[PDB]
Design an enzyme around this catalytic site. Structure first.
Site, short mmCIF file in Angstrom:
data_model
loop_
_atom_site.label_atom_id
_atom_site.label_comp_id
_atom_site.label_asym_id
_atom_site.label_seq_id
_atom_site.Cartn_x
_atom_site.Cartn_y
_atom_site.Cartn_z
N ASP A 125 0.84 -1.21 0.00
CA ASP A 125 0.00 0.00 0.00
C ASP A 125 0.87 1.25 0.00
OD1 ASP A 125 -2.43 1.38 -0.07
OD2 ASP A 125 -2.55 1.44 2.15
N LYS A 148 2.43 3.32 -5.98
CA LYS A 148 1.95 2.21 -6.81
C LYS A 148 2.98 1.66 -7.80
CE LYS A 148 -1.26 3.21 -4.10
NZ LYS A 148 -1.02 2.58 -2.71
N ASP A 172 -3.45 -3.08 -2.15
CA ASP A 172 -4.50 -2.07 -2.18
C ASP A 172 -4.48 -1.33 -3.52
OD1 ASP A 172 -6.66 -0.54 -1.22
OD2 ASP A 172 -5.33 0.93 -0.25
N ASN A 173 -5.61 -0.74 -3.93
CA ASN A 173 -5.62 0.25 -5.02
C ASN A 173 -5.30 -0.38 -6.35
OD1 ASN A 173 -3.95 2.11 -2.59
ND2 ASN A 173 -6.03 2.67 -3.25
N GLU A 177 -11.37 4.39 -0.26
CA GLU A 177 -11.63 4.88 1.11
C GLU A 177 -12.41 6.21 1.11
OE1 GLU A 177 -8.59 3.95 -0.17
OE2 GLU A 177 -7.03 5.46 0.24
#
Ligand code: SAM
Ligand code: TCW
Ligand code: CL
Ligand code: CL
Ligand code: CL
Ligand code: MG
Length: 213
Positions: A139, A142, A167-168, A197
């Site tokens: 996380d 990226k 994540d993401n 989020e």
């Protein structure tokens, strides 16, 4: 006065000391009502919770701590004696994370590694007495998810069954990492669709289980 300092102060003013759930809910309330921030958040965090509970990892590595939201979220579910190591290259944010763990009473379970994942990952076995990781929560920036996955494998930190949880993978997105693990026979992947989020933009977590060399 920084947004991260504001989050921390709001937690100290509102949450119950030693109560990780209370701390999570306070951060979520602040970021939902006052200032958006890049915590994994409650919707994806419930998925994280279910994954943690399924695997019961003894040793978890987190990449990107920020204010300690995800660290509190995972550490509060670890079994006695299990450990979380979290890497954070921003010293201001690492300071806030440590204070957040202290408040939640989770400090004994979590170790903050200050610096960049790419420099710290090769020092884990020696400096922190790590054999292999049971779980990794990716996380951070990226563009590092793929390079750090390759680096974890190079440094012998993955074992058959190690769970990567990213994540993401939709937003902001991690296209090279996602293409790589979904295409590689070294990983078995599962996608958990959710929401960014504090918003209704679709995002998701990818679970990629290392299958061995
Ligand atoms: C999305 S935030 C982490 C949020 C946290 N996992 C949570 O859910 O509450 C990303 C963090 O990654 C950190 N970061 C970015 N690249 C990094 C790297 N190569 N090594 C260590 N930390 C890094 C940033 O400073 C920032 O605190
Ligand atoms: C300018 C901008 C654009 C998009 C976001 C953003 O959506 C975001 C969300 C995350 O969960 C997350 O982990 C990160 N990150 O690490 O960079 C960014 C955050 C800031
Ligand atoms: Cl690099
Ligand atoms: Cl949320
Ligand atoms: Cl939205
Ligand atoms: Mg994120």
């Amino acid at each position: 006065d920084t947004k991260e300092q504001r989050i921390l102060r709001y937690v100290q003013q509102n949450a119950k000391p030693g109560d990780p759930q209370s701390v999570l809910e306070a951060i979520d309330t602040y970021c939902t009502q006052k200032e958006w921030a890049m915590n994994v958040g409650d919707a994806k965090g419930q998925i994280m919770d279910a994954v943690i509970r399924e695997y019961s990892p003894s040793l978890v590595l987190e990449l990107g701590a920020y204010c300690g939201y995800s660290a509190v979220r995972m550490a509060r579910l670890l079994q006695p004696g299990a450990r979380l190591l979290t890497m954070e290259m921003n010293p201001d944010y690492a300071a806030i994370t440590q204070q957040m763990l202290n408040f939640a009473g989770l400090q004994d379970k979590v170790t903050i590694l200050n610096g960049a994942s790419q420099d710290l990952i090769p020092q884990l076995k020696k400096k922190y007495d790590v054999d292999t990781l049971d779980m990794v929560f990716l996380d951070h920036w990226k563009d590092r998810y793929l390079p750090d996955t390759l680096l974890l494998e190079k440094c012998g930190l993955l074992r058959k069954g190690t769970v990567l949880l990213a994540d993401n993978v939709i937003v902001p997105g991690t296209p090279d990492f996602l293409a790589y693990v979904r295409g590689s026979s070294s990983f078995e992947c599962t996608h958990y669709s959710s929401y960014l989020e504090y918003m209704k933009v679709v995002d998701g977590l990818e679970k990629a289980i290392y299958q061995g060399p």
